[model samples]
Target: GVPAGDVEKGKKIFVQRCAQCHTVEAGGKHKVGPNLHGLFGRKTGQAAGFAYTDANKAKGITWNEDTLFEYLENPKKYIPGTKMIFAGLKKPNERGDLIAYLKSATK
Candidate 1:
């Protein structure tokens, strides 16, 4: 289930932890990773030139809250052979907040 979180707090946390390689602004260019501009509810592996691994490409997911949350909890665990290198945020609340932030930014 989706947790209630402060979007403001989530935005702050995201900027600090995730902004280095991600861009939440729509129409933004990809950085080390693809721009996370319209990620929420998006189809996984549809973005161009992203170099998705076979595992990631095969996920066959719609990026809803559950899918995104699980991925945030553990990238490699969620998608075996995924290339994301950041160790996941183990605290459930933090993952929720980050997802919340992404939701807000994209909406």
Candidate 2:
């Protein structure tokens, strides 16, 4: 089940933790990482124009609530050798909050 969280807080968390690498606004350009607009319903490595690893492009995973929850908890463990290098978000609430924020912002 998805945890309830403050969207405002989550936005703050996103800006602090993800803004350096990602862009969440619609039609936003890629930063160090791919633009995350419309991420929830997309395939794991299908962001257009971004160079994805064969492993990632071929893994064939779809992003959704469950997948994002697991992946955000531990990116490397969820998909070994994925280019994202940040250590996982350690707090459950924070992860929920981040997801909630993404849900709203990425639309």
Candidate 3:
């Protein structure tokens, strides 16, 4: 089960850690990373016009509170050979918070 989170805190965390590469607005811009619009319940590597690695496409992970909780902790660890360079959150609570913010803001 995923832990509870604080959206406000999560927003701050995203700005600090994720804003450079990811854009969460609806029809969000594609940056270094793909747009995360409607990420929850969506499969990985499906963002149009954004190139993704074969491993990410083949892995076919569904995004959700639970899956993202684990993935964001260590993106490369969870999906090896994917080009996402995020070092990872490492803290469970921080990940939960980021997931919450992504759920709310990226919808």
List RMSD in Å for every model shown. 1.3, 1.1, 0.8
Q: After superposition, how far is residue 50 of candidate 2 from its true place, in Å?
A: 0.8
Query: Could you give me the TM-score of model 2 versus the true structure?
Result: 0.93
lDDT string for model 2 (4-92, tens) is: 77789899989999999999887898877988888888888878888877767766788877788888898888888888878988898
**Candidate 2: which pairs clash?**
none
**What TM-score does candidate 3 reach?**
0.96
lDDT of 1 by residue, 1-107 (tens): 96967788888878887888778787887777778767777787766666777887898889977887788888899888987777887888887887888888977
Worst 10 residues of 1 by lDDT: 44-53
The sequence of per-residue lDDT tens digits that candidate 3 reaches over residues 1-107 is 98789999999999999999999887878998999998888898988889999989988879999889888888888999989999999999899898889999978
- How do all the candidates rank in terms of lDDT, highest first? 3, 2, 1
Pairs clashing within candidate 1: none
CA shift of 6, model 1, Å:
1.0
Stretches of candidate 2 off by over 4 Å are none
